[PDB]
Amino acid sequence: DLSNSVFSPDGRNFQVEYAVKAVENGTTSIGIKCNDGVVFAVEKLITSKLLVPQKNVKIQVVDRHIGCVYSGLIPDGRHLVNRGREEAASFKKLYKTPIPIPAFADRLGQYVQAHTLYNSVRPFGVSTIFGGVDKNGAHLYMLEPSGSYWGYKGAATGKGRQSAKAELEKLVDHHPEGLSAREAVKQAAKIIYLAHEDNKEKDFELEISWCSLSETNGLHKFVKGDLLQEAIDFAQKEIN
């Protein structure tokens, strides 16, 4: 059970489970596919008053149209992003047309894939949420340590995933036609707050980004500024 390559008496790779186990342990991240485009949010945890606010960004863009976030082992996340960054930019130089989200995941999945094959390497310790647009709409997926990922209507990992899960459950049925681009944000703003109630004694800072042909204009922009505030307050009222 101790090496990364090996199988258990009935076909099982434990190192990957623990990988998963550490992904849960970290902060919580989410994302939501709406009308056109997507919306992401993470949980920066202010451990002291000596942390400059609006600073240590956990969310990252890829190319100029792909939002991206995760949770678990922070350096592992960052690393994985770089690879995704090359692959993107190389493809782009080659086919000219900005990279289709559908395949992108694979390029990554295939890379996360490898780190489950050899013993000399360590399994990727992060679950990753992301999405963006293109011609045939916006998409959103979520990659785990096993390398297996899929497309979701909205995703979640890190500490309290259920909170946001059952929370994402509702939205589905009342808005079975995709939630409004705008409301998507402010709604995400809330879904986070609700899921934070574990690190409750410890304050925090919420970060949000999104994509949309109407709002962002095909791009991925950081939800910061005015819309950012009201989206909080919006959460602050329902926070009772």
Partner: protein
């Protein structure tokens, strides 16, 4: 433990590998038409937060070759890719499109090589390739992780193998031929779903399943809607 002979020459990592293929939990069956071929696989979507489009265990390798795999999605997408490119490289290097039976060879070959040289852990998936080539027509060959392939007149992969099997076997001792007598695919499709429902003591809606069809050089995945209409077809006629 590790990849080098047991005392009875049976290096288990290869054996262990198998359970995991199975472990996924889905049933895959396949049968030949007369001018087409078909495979059945279940499409169990638990999490109400996913998207059924993104789900599948069958992919379009080539213009005419499709593939189904009873096994863990990460390892599958891999096999999918390599294979998908071996054929891509072939047509180029040789002038004619690569047939079923062959891909399954370099494929088994590949998994053998790994296994013997130790350059990685075997993927825990069984690949079931389908198509129809104008040299042997309706073709069906399967491959396992212990690097090995062979032929089937109709096969199955799953937690419940022999059940799906025995039925077909009995249906074959009678039909006596080594395939399915019938002209239309719609009709064959109907037939398999039939032989599976009966084989599970279970019923499927129009999304609970997953099926593919290999034609006269134009392989296509069966989609959500068309899929249902076959249940319409095979309801009264039963």
């Amino acid at each position: 433990h590790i990849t080098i002979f047991s005392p009875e020459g049976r290096l288990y990592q290869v054996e262990y590998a198998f359970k995991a293929t199975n472990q996924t939990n889905i049933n895959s069956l396949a049968v030949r038409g007369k001018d087409c071929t078909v495979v059945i696989s279940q499409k169990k979507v638990p999490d109400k937060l996913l998207d059924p489009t993104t789900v599948s265990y069958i992919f379009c390798i080539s213009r005419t070759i499709g593939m189904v795999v009873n096994g863990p999605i990460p390892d599958a997408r891999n096999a999918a890719l390599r294979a998908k490119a071996e054929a891509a490289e072939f047509r180029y290097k040789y002038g004619y499109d690569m047939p079923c039976d062959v891909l399954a060879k370099r494929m088994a070959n590949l998994s053998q090589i790994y296994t013997q040289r130790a350059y990685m852990r075997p993927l825990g998936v069984i690949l079931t390739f389908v198509s129809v080539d104008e040299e042997l027509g309706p073709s069906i060959y399967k491959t396992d992780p212990a690097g090995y392939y062979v032929g089937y007149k109709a096969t199955a992969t799953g937690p419940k193998q022999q059940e799906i099997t025995t039925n077909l076997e009995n249906h074959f001792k009678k039909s006596k031929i080594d395939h399915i007598n019938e002209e239309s695919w719609e009709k064959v499709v109907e037939f398999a779903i039939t032989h599976m429902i009966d084989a599970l003591g279970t019923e499927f809606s129009k999304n609970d399943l997953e099926v593919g069809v290999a034609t006269k050089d134009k392989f296509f995945t069966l989609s959500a809607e068309n899929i249902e209409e076959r249940l319409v077809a095979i309801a009264e006629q039963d």
